[PDB]
Amino acid sequence: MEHTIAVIPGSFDPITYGHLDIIERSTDRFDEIHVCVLKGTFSLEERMDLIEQSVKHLPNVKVHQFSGLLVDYCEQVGAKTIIRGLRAVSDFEYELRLTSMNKKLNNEIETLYMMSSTNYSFISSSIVKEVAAYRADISEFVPPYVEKALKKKFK
Ligand SMILES: Nc1ncnc2c1ncn2[C@@H]1O[C@H](COP(=O)(O)OS(=O)(=O)O)[C@@H](OP(=O)(O)O)[C@H]1O
């Protein structure tokens, strides 16, 4: 096993414990992990900062951004794996299109799906921002820094 790099894509708007769980479960399986923000409630720089403060405890996790094909990013940084989470509330056909296309564009990159834990298998950033907008207790869905920002925004 040479030096392995895995990219965990998303628009992380914002990053939730759901995403965070996938990142943490991945750190010990690749030498290098890149959380890449591609393609909104929070600005791009805002979202990177939120991810950053949320993964300070994970030394091998980098936070970068990219505009363009995710596969081009992977080819640039030498990443050969794309990590995606599979949840009960996932859009299966959407995942099929997305991943099948990435495979066509560059098959030297494998997308690996990790199934979400039962407690995060039902949330998404949308539903979370929604209840946050109505000032519900959201400490269960997002890390401290993110919750602080969401509240700040939806005050
Ligand atoms: N691991 C995990 N846990 C919980 N939720 C997750 C996870 N990964 C992706 N998502 C949510 O799936 C929706 C689409 O993801 P993205 O907007 O990042 O697009 S992309 O497919 O990742 O490119 C989007 O939620 P929506 O708010 O319903 O659009 C992402 O926040």
Side-chain angles (χ1 to χ4, degrees):
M1 272 313 115
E2 54 181 356
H3 186 261
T4 62
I5 301 174
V7 173
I8 305 188
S11 74
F12 311 92
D13 189 34
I15 183 178
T16 69
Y17 276 135
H19 304 89
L20 192 282
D21 185 39
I22 300 298
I23 309 305
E24 289 179 344
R25 286 163 63 188
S26 298
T27 59
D28 295 309
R29 296 163 185 286
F30 299 82
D31 306 291
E32 206 178 310
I33 296 294
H34 290 202
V35 183
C36 197
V37 188
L38 287 290
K39 293 302 178 182
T41 303
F42 291 93
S43 77
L44 178 278
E45 16 287 298
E46 275 180 345
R47 292 180 298 195
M48 294 191 71
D49 176 61
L50 291 185
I51 304 291
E52 280 161 25
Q53 305 307 103
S54 302
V55 304
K56 291 301 190 177
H57 60 293
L58 313 169
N60 84 316
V61 175
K62 295 184 180 179
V63 183
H64 295 293
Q65 54 149 293
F66 193 70
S67 60
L69 300 176
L70 168 67
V71 295
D72 283 326
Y73 178 78
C74 300
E75 175 162 54
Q76 297 184 56
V77 310
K80 294 179 172 191
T81 307
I82 288 171
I83 294 294
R84 295 187 62 77
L86 189 51
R87 313 112 69 200
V89 297
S90 278
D91 183 331
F92 197 57
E93 296 65 56
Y94 169 73
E95 290 302 315
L96 289 174
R97 278 194 297 280
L98 175 173
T99 292
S100 172
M101 180 58 92
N102 287 157
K103 185 156 183 287
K104 298 284 191 181
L105 304 172
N106 192 322
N107 71 173
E108 301 189 330
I109 302 184
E110 285 293 337
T111 291
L112 300 182
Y113 285 84
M114 180 184 285
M115 227 155 239
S116 169
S117 61
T118 73
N119 199 58
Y120 300 134
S121 199
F122 303 82
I123 89 288
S124 64
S125 296
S126 287
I127 193 68
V128 168
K129 290 178 299 188
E130 184 165 349
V131 299
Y134 291 116
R135 282 135 295 185
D137 318 311
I138 70 297
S139 78
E140 156 166 34
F141 319 108
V142 299
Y145 196 74
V146 171
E147 163 174 36
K148 188 186 185 299
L150 279 168
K151 287 187 172 182
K152 183 76 176 186
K153 173 152 291 185
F154 296 127
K155 39 60 176 188

